[PDB]
């Protein structure tokens, strides 16, 4: 209980850094999976708005009226979804430095323990295998 105490305490820090990296990694994948979900729906809402107002221009030269409100509702939901989709892009943009720095310092703690005598079985226990 002296120099090994420092090894055990640092090895405990390796656990916390590993959890935090995996906890923010799990958070980052939820944001990306939901981000591509909304942008695909933004696409569909977009060309649906096209075919909406294109059913107007294609038959306004001849002259079917209450359809304008459906297009106004879609354009309302479009920029409301694009707003929330922008917030998702902002949330996970501030995570990349967190993920990179957590991963780098996790590796540096792993290497520090290796140089101090911690074998591979000790490293896996702190890493949850």
């Amino acid at each position: 209980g002296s120099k090994e105490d420092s090894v055990e305490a640092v090895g405990a820090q390796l656990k916390v850094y590993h959890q935090q990296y995996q906890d923010k990694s799990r958070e980052y994948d939820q944001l990306y999976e939901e981000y591509t979900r909304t942008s695909q729906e933004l696409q569909m809402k977009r060309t649906a708005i096209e075919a909406f107002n294109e059913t107007i221009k294609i038959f306004e030269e001849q002259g079917i009226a209450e359809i304008h409100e459906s297009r106004t509702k879609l354009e309302q939901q479009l920029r409301a979804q694009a707003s929330d989709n922008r917030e998702i892009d902002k949330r996970m943009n501030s995570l990349k430095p967190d993920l990179m720095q957590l991963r780098k310092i996790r590796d540096q703690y792993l290497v520090w323990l290796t140089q101090k005598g911690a074998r591979q079985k000790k490293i896996n226990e702190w890493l949850g295998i």
């Binding site: 990179m100 991963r103 590796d107 520090w112 074998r119 591979q120 490293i123």
Partner: protein, 127 residues
């Protein structure tokens, strides 16, 4: 700018390895270790390091692997000493390559190492 590249997995970073004829040198606060009993094989230098301004910033770990996956060399910062510089890492690689080639080993660097701090120019390998 400002990235973190990893050629090695967590297993490769943490794997135990043994040297029959240990040789250790020091380049700054980096520790260069290699097994002098290794001869006539193709060795690859794989490293984890951060970059900044498209230059190698800080080395996390470097290890030398044979074709079969055995670890025969390593460069790592000393745990009790402060950090190192871009120039220190390159000097360490030159010491490891030069010392590994004295035993007729064909040492190569990875694609990421070749982009920010490479060496050698390489020699022929034996079957």
């Amino acid at each position: 700018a400002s990235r973190y590249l990893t050629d090695m997995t967590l297993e490769e970073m943490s794997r135990d390895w043994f040297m029959l004829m240990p040789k250790q040198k020091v380049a700054g606060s980096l520790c260069i270790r290699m097994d002098q009993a290794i001869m006539d094989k193709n060795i690859i230098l794989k490293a984890n390091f951060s970059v900044i301004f498209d230059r190698l910033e800080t080395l996390i770990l470097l290890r030398a692997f044979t074709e079969e996956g055995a670890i025969v060399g390593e460069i790592s910062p000393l745990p009790s000493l402060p950090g190192h510089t871009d120039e220190d890492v390159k000097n360490a690689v030159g010491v490891l390559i030069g010392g590994l080639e004295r035993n007729d080993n064909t040492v190569r660097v990875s694609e990421t190492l070749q982009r920010f701090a490479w060496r050698s120019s390489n020699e022929n390998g034996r079957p």
